[PDB]
């Protein structure tokens, strides 16, 4: 009958804890591969979607405090409907997507703006703009089978009580299973995989101190506090 | 802890004479840090996702949606202590050790993000982006702060200089990725290239190296 004995390989120096995010009314959680963020994707002939990454150690909990980061006075948040993946796959097309999403949740795109109008005057890449420390805070994880896959509702993310951002799903100009599919061209997708979809109007600062909340409609909601300016 | 989903081992690279391996945290990459030769201006950065480091031997893989592989050959440090705000005179302590590595790019969709302002992601953190050595100790290296650094593809040079050629030094580029981030244990810094500019094809035998570090070979695989 069916046996297996698998070897974990040794480390030469201590190794971190890899990066997971919290599931939903679980004790498990989900194991980060790569973070994909769709560059701008909502509307009040369509161009092909583009993309930056964040590196999977810079999602972190959408709860308690997210550290303001070094190297910026001007720290924006896009708050962003996040797929998670549970299935590998390459050239997938549009119709077969959603069944490569494992669950979904709610994210904040930070970005040190003001690294990223230097980058973008030089044409130089976005790495330190996007994919610094705590540069994507996610909510706990729901599996799709407790959600469905969300097309339509209220996008949203205040701060310190007031509104910043209020959109809808359905503004998506790219919906999910396009940018899966957009994504899975480029390289191959695997389980693991997070996605930023996007954000709807209103991208502003976050100071140190500030208490940011948002969410989406029958996903998540959060609420955390921005940390001190190092 | 447990999963939701199988987990792929986590990203590794071969630790020279050890069954042990070195455990990749997040991977920065220097942008133009060497002269033709011997008021510089602050280095920049790209990254690469710490999965796409695979070994410089075998077959690498040619990527998607490109028609234009190049190839930069660059010495890697990797990182064994974490540290922010690291002055340089204290980066070369957080070194675990060194390898050879290839930062390999979708140059034509490279172009087009320099020319539309976008992100570099497509075109410099594709899958098997960057193939490296097995990494050896400092304790047995030494810091190199000179020698050639080639690559040669079907044994014909197509980069060559030397480490002294760096305009940052390994200690000052340590420096500048740690007052961006916290610098951890397991990353890896890819510190720059020497001259000549080359695209790679299917069937191409890439050989390279850092003298005093390591050399390899590899193949290009198929176009997809």
């Given at each position: 009958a069916h046996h297996h004995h698998h070897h974990m390989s040794a480390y030469v120096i201590d190794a971190a804890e890899r990066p997971s995010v919290e599931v939903d009314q679980s004790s498990a959680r989900f194991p980060v591969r790569r973070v994909f963020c769709v560059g701008r994707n909502y509307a009040d002939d369509r161009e092909p979607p583009f993309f930056f990454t964040k590196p999977a150690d810079a999602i972190v909990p959408a709860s308690g405090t997210v550290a303001y980061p070094p190297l910026t006075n001007d720290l924006h948040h896009e708050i962003e409907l996040v797929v998670a993946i549970g299935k590998d796959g390459r050239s997938i097309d549009p119709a077969d997507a959603l069944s490569h999403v494992w669950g979904y949740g709610v994210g904040v795109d930070l970005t040190r703006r003001d690294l990223q109008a230097e980058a973008k005057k030089l044409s130089r890449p976005w790495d330190w703009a996007k994919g610094f420390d705590a540069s994507g805070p996610v909510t706990a994880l729901r599996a799709a089978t407790a959600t469905?896959?969300?097309?339509?509702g209220r996008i949203w993310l205040a701060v310190n009580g007031d509104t910043r951002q209020q959109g809808d799903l359905a503004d998506m100009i790219w919906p999910v299973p396009d940018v899966i599919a957009y994504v899975s061209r480029s390289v191959e997708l695997k389980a693991g995989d997070l996605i930023f979809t996007g954000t709807p109007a209103g991208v502003g600062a976050l100071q140190p101190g500030d208490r940011v909340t948002g969410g989406v409609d029958g996903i998540a909601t959060f609420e955390f506090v921005v940390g001190a300016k190092p």
């Open positions: 469905g896959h969300p097309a339509a």
